[PDB]
Amino acid sequence: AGGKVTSSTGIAPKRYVYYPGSEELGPDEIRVIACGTGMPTARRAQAAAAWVVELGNGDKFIVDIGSGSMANIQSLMIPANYLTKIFLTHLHTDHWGDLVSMWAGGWTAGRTDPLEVWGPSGSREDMGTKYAVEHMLKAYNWDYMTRAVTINPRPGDINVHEFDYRALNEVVYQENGVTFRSWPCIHAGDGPVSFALEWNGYKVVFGGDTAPNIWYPEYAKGADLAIHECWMTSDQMMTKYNQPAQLALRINLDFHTSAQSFGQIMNMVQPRHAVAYAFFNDDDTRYDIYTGVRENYAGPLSMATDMMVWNITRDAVTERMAVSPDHAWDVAASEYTQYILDGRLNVDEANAHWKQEFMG
Amino acid sequence: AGGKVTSSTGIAPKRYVYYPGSEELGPDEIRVIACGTGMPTARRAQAAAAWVVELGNGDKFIVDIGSGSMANIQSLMIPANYLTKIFLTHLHTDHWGDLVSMWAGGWTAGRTDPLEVWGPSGSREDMGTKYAVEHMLKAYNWDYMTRAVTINPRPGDINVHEFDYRALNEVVYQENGVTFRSWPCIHAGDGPVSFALEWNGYKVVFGGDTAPNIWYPEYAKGADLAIHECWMTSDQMMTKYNQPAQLALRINLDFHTSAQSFGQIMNMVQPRHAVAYAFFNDDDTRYDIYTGVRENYAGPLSMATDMMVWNITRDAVTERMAVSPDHAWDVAASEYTQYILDGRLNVDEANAHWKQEFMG
Amino acid sequence: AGGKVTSSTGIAPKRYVYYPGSEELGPDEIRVIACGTGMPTARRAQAAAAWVVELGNGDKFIVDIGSGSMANIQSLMIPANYLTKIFLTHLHTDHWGDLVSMWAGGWTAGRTDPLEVWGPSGSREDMGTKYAVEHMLKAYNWDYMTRAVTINPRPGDINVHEFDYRALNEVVYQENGVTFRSWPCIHAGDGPVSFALEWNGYKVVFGGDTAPNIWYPEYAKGADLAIHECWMTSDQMMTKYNQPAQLALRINLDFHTSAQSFGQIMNMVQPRHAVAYAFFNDDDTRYDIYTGVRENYAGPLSMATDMMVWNITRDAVTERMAVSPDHAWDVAGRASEYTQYILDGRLNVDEANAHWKQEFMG
């Protein structure tokens, strides 16, 4: 597997696992990274939905940032500064739960620019992202204000860029050649939207969560990498959750997007590479799902789990697995009252030795 | 290692690892599990500050619920209804940033009763727990309201218990013979507490975060298990973060408790078992931080890391590691317009085959 | 998942993962753990072929103990005294490589009984398991002998039970209502076999390695669990190894059972549950190997990986993943080879130890 090693001291070229930080990115390359691939419940194996896009121009975007995902992203050896721009498909906890870890993380890590979040609005004001993020920052006021004694604020504020969720394929973004176009989803209630990044002959479709809609097959068409929701079987639902045979069925026909329906949809889209996510990829579950997609779609497919990579070049769409550090490191008025400051225990004696050495 | 097997087919007694869900709790026993141990930065090896505490009476608490920790908490195979009661040592994102995941996740899981959150105030309204939770709830108002349509809204409530943070070893919880006292800590700004849980002759202190203070050594005294802040050395702060000498020195005095500071307090508390946490537990870090302590403290110590489980009985406080599933499962007006509902693609065909087959 | 938790302080019943040590085995129960599911080449994620079998009568068996398999076998919290019977499907390193780890290992851990090894004959004396095991024990004579000074030599023996590789589903082991049958495979050269375990009306079959043969479909028939080679797709053979098209083809027809061949074999046998192993279980191999079998076989299947476990009861063959300590420990259940030339090289370490030596002696 991977390229042929030439010299004993020489670097293995075209490695068959992706080491984040180790590889140059082509001007005519994209590098996508599943930093989140599972849904409702948490699990070391699968963070909540989160993707890292890396364009050869230098522009990098996080599309969804759910609970768990921050751990994987931080393993990518990418400084805080470069990951400022965030794109949410809906306001489910497991799509932007970990914005605050980023928000707070990056600020302590030395991020200089404020996070820019694009999201869908709601049917009313309190159902949108402008509201959601506005209340987040209020929620974490005790964090914000304390930190904003010792660190310049600006990297604390969040420039939100809300749009109309109802809008069919309209332009939500356009800088440095990169375009994002959002369109609606039929999931839980009004607001949820699917994205389509377009840049340098390349098209990448983020499906977020949706029961099958007529806006995906249309605006997806002829994409390098197309990601869409693709769910457990109605059998597996009964097994795991103890569901009965009417709820189990409907969940795959009404509320969510089946495998067998995920297939038909991509068959319509004809992407360079289709990507099925948002299911617990386990030894007892993953297979039956793959046999669904196959019924009605026979093109290049990735059954997504955490830290799966796509290198979109001209010639090919190559899937690999990232192998990244678990012991990950970041890479490069007073909120005290005199009632708290007058408590400081004397440790001047306990610490005199190490200090002395440290100061000589 | 562990108990002596007494039959081929029988269970291994006093096993050398803790297998979550596999062991009965005794009546005069306490299980504390570290589900978070690792400062603000994200990494799979170490979730943010989170502890699960099981008492023999049948009560169970969570003390801090920082980003990531829900992946460790959920692996303990505990029905979400038993984990309703949550004590917050403060409102850093790395202490309560995964309550949201608990809130939403646990409600899909099947929590029937609301979440109960014990936290401090600030030195004004918009710096305390009552304010952060109500603004966290409004933050996720789309998630709340969409789910409410299809699941009774009762569990989606959070009952907030603001305590006064100023208070100096004063009761904040007294139910079923279990008594939580708080006291202030010196960290970021006014607000952060430590917790003393008392029950059936046991005492378990949760430090949280604190520069050395005159209250912890007094109020934690003789604790069966004593958890305190322990930072990484002022060389280590230069090595990893590129920090200057002047700053790195300061950090292990003003901002955080040194391993040496940590040693003094533990000398002055003389607990049955000490625990250092909050430092990154690595090959290249752990040994100088462990030594830092040994300058002053000599008795029993754990160097904390995710899924360390303490067993507190009359005779011993025994250290082990929990071995738990990464592929974890849970254990037992509309917000749609007719503009979105119209959008449904037709997949009666593609789903026909499996649909007919499942129904018999 | 699993069973409903009925008390706060009590035990989770029927847990969805298998914690080894943690479950009692009922008398009509069979537990099978995959301790090695991997190809010829080493990898942490997958040990070479190994299987641990637990029958509810108290009897246990390892079928194959290939390279890297002991790390998984040790993780099951079974005392060495309980794992002394080892069956080999052939003498590929990838199938008995770690025999010498269990032998030397267990003898430290404190095993009292010799190891017992059933293995095929060859066409001739020096292609069989008696010859193999004789010359392993010669290969590791410095360990056998040095260890024998300090530890009783009895358990450092290995009684070999060589059977006839040519024999068509004949008994190789009959003991305490347990039967092992062997039949031939078509693999590397003459030697290799499959096994059928017959106990309490249960039939577990360990296929080993073999190009599709006429013996497996016949004898395995109606197995409770039937374990069979399931190779990686010729396409993947090109991609991964840069194999020229026409060679890759030959491998999936001639030298190893392809997924469709496995799919055909398992329709004929009609097992309660069918296991594919041998192949590298990756995010970019497993699925088309599943596709392959599903073309030809429709009933209950597992796609093997390390620490996969089957419990066989009258009512079910349930598949879980085991969750097992990486930081594993052993669970408890003649003249000197020194000359004074080497003994006169010791260092005086009375000073530096004094402090821990004083304290520890109180």
Next chain:
Amino acid sequence: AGGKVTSSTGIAPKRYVYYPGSEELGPDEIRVIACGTGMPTARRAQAAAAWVVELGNGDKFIVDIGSGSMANIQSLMIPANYLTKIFLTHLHTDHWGDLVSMWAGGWTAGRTDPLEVWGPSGSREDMGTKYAVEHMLKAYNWDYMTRAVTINPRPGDINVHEFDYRALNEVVYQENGVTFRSWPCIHAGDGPVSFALEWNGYKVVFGGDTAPNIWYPEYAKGADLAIHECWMTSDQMMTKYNQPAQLALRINLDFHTSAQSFGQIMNMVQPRHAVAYAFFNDDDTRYDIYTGVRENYAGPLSMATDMMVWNITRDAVTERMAVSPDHAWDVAGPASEYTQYILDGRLNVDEANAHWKQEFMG
């Protein structure tokens, strides 16, 4: 931590982890991977003792290669044909046990060259390395002869270079500016030796296993990277294994090198970077072992675990963790034993295979 990123599309320099295959080794640089730090029992967390060296010249050695070390070694993305030369400290299974996965593996991992194995003699022929390997090849006879049939058997040769164990720092290897010297060790029985690697004024000592001996401290002097046995405290011997204090107390004074002896030795040696191994590095064990070193040694210290790497440059000795593939694949470098009683067993699967064969061949 590590070097600064100064480009968005760029390679991040001086990374705080080591990504095997990803780093260019310099002329004035040695790279030392622990491919195995473990004890006599199996655990996934720690293979039995093994080491890989890669020298700035291009030369690459394995020092010891114990059971379950081949996973970690395969994870390094080094072609098999670059890991030809093997040195054994002793004939403990936990030190050479995975020479047979190297031999069978490497062959199918692209080794065209035969194995060179340097090991020590014992008190007699049957206790040397010549004999061990002789009989190892004889163990896997079935493996050899089937494998070789239609192939060149060259890389199937293990050339053993056996030296005297009682020879005091006498050269056992001199090739392309690399020197290996050996002295004895006190351990089990006359035979175990400890190597020193010399090259470009670099000294890298490979202890092996030994109770404190007078030799190591002399010949390991001014080491760049001095590796040595370090045992668990006599406490951790009573806790886990249930030893009486007497035996527990003695284990650490008589048989094995105590944390305090380890430190007494490295103070005598004065190495640029010492390396304790050969203990189960666990959350309840590692701390009482560091301390017992620190008693009598204050130099740069590594507490060894599987996949730790040391970069030996002119300016420093930098310790790191290797981040590597669990899904390991080999990387490409630059009379038949069948009777017709077995080849007459081949099943018809021409139907089943028809669909995929047609697709693949077009």
